[PDB]
Design an enzyme around this catalytic site. Structure first.
Site, short mmCIF file in Angstrom:
data_model
loop_
_atom_site.label_atom_id
_atom_site.label_comp_id
_atom_site.label_asym_id
_atom_site.label_seq_id
_atom_site.Cartn_x
_atom_site.Cartn_y
_atom_site.Cartn_z
N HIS A 19 -2.52 -13.47 -6.07
CA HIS A 19 -2.20 -14.82 -6.56
C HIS A 19 -1.71 -16.33 -5.79
CE1 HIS A 19 -3.96 -13.32 -10.15
NE2 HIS A 19 -3.55 -12.20 -10.16
N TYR A 47 -1.32 -6.92 13.17
CA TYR A 47 -2.06 -5.67 13.07
C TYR A 47 -2.54 -4.71 14.50
CZ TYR A 47 -4.65 -4.64 8.97
OH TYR A 47 -4.87 -4.11 7.68
N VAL A 125 0.10 -0.05 3.05
CA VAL A 125 0.32 -1.69 2.44
C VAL A 125 -0.91 -2.61 2.79
CG1 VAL A 125 0.97 -4.21 2.09
CG2 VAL A 125 2.35 -1.96 1.04
N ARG A 126 -1.40 -2.25 4.06
CA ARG A 126 -2.65 -2.97 5.25
C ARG A 126 -3.69 -2.28 4.87
NH1 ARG A 126 -2.83 -7.75 5.38
NH2 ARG A 126 -4.70 -6.94 5.56
N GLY A 129 -5.62 -1.95 1.10
CA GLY A 129 -5.39 -3.07 0.81
C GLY A 129 -6.97 -3.53 1.88
N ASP A 130 -7.12 -3.04 3.05
CA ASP A 130 -8.21 -3.28 3.22
C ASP A 130 -9.66 -2.67 2.79
OD1 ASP A 130 -7.11 -4.97 5.68
OD2 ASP A 130 -6.50 -3.20 6.97
N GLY A 134 -9.85 -5.55 0.32
CA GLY A 134 -10.40 -5.66 1.72
C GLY A 134 -12.35 -6.06 1.84
#
Ligand SMILES: OC[C@H]1O[C@@](CO)(O[C@H]2O[C@H](CO)[C@@H](O)[C@H](O)[C@H]2O)[C@@H](O)[C@@H]1O
Length: 207
Positions: A19, A47, A125-126, A129-130, A134
Site C-alpha cells: 500500500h 538484486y 522476501v524478494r 514476492g517476484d 510480481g
C-alpha cells in the site's frame, strides 16, 4: 514451521509494502512506463547486491537447495532495462537512491560476514514476492502502460514449470533448514527489515 511463522511475522510489513503510494499508483495505472523503468533500475542495483550475497552464502555451504541459481535476476533485469531504455547507456547513468544505498549496504554486510540466516530472509522476501505479486505486476505493466513482455523477463523464471509447485517446494526447504535458536530469531527479524528496506525504496521512488 518456519514458513508459516515467516509469513505471519511479516504480514503487517507486506501490507505496508503493498500500500505504499508509489507501488499503489504504479499498479492502479496512475503512473507510466517511465516510473516502472525507474523501479527496475533501482532493482537492478539491489538484486546485483542480493545475488552477490547469495553467491557468498551458497559457496559457504549454507541453504544450498534453497539458493537455486535459476532464480538469479540480475542479467535478465539488465536485458529488460536495455529494452526499456533503448540502449545499454543506463549502466553508467543510474544512481542509487538513499534507500537503495542502505539496502545494498545491508546486503554487502551479509555477504562479507557470510550471514546465512540473514541472506535466507532477504531471498524469501524478494524472490517469493517476484513469484507471487510480481506476476500481477508484470500483467498490469503490459495492460496499463503497453510495456512489451520482452521487457518483463524479470517476472519470468525460465525452467520453473509451475510457480505454485515451486513455492510449496521452497516453503518445505525453509521448514527443513537447520537453525540454532538465535539464527532462527535473526532470520525472522531480518525478514521484516527486508520488507522495510523495500518500503523505503518505494518511498524514494514516489519522491
Ligand atoms: O496474501 C499475501 C499477504 O497479505 C496479508 C497481509 O497483507 O494478508 C492480507 O491479504 C490476504 C490475501 O492476499 C488476505 O487473505 C488477508 O486477510 C489479508 O490480511 C498476509 O497475511 C499475507 O501473507
Amino acid at each position: 514451521g518456519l514458513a508459516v511463522e515467516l509469513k505471519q511475522s511479516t504480514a503487517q510489513a507486506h501490507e505496508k509494502a503493498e500500500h505504499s503510494t508509489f507501488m499503489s499508483d504504479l499498479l492502479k495505472g496512475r503512473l507510466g512506463v517511465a516510473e516502472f523503468t525507474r523501479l527496475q533500475e533501482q532493482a537492478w542495483l539491489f538484486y546485483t547486491a542480493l545475488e552477490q550475497a547469495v553467491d557468498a552464502v551458497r559457496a559457504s555451504g549454507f541453504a544450498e537447495s534453497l539458493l537455486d541459481p535459476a532464480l538469479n535476476r540480475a542479467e535478465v533485469l539488465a536485458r529488460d532495462l536495455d529494452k526499456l531504455n533503448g540502449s545499454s547507456e543506463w549502466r553508467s547513468r543510474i544512481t542509487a537512491s538513499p534507500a537503495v544505498i542502505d539496502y545494498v549496504n545491508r546486503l554487502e554486510e551479509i555477504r562479507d560476514n557470510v550471514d546465512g540466516p540473514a541472506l535466507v530472509a532477504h531471498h524469501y522476501v524478494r524472490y517469493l514476492g517476484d513469484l507471487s505479486g510480481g506476476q500481477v505486476i508484470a500483467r498490469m505493466m503490459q495492460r496499463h502502460y503497453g510495456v512489451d513482455p520482452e521487457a518483463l523477463g524479470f517476472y519470468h523464471f525460465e525452467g520453473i514449470a509451475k510457480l505454485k509447485v515451486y513455492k510449496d517446494e521452497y516453503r518445505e526447504k525453509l521448514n527443513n533448514l537447520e537453525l540454532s535458536d538465535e539464527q532462527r530469531e535473526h532470520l525472522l527479524k531480518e525478514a521484516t527489515d527486508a520488507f522495510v528496506f523495500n518500503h523505503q525504496v518505494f518511498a524514494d521512488l514516489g519522491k
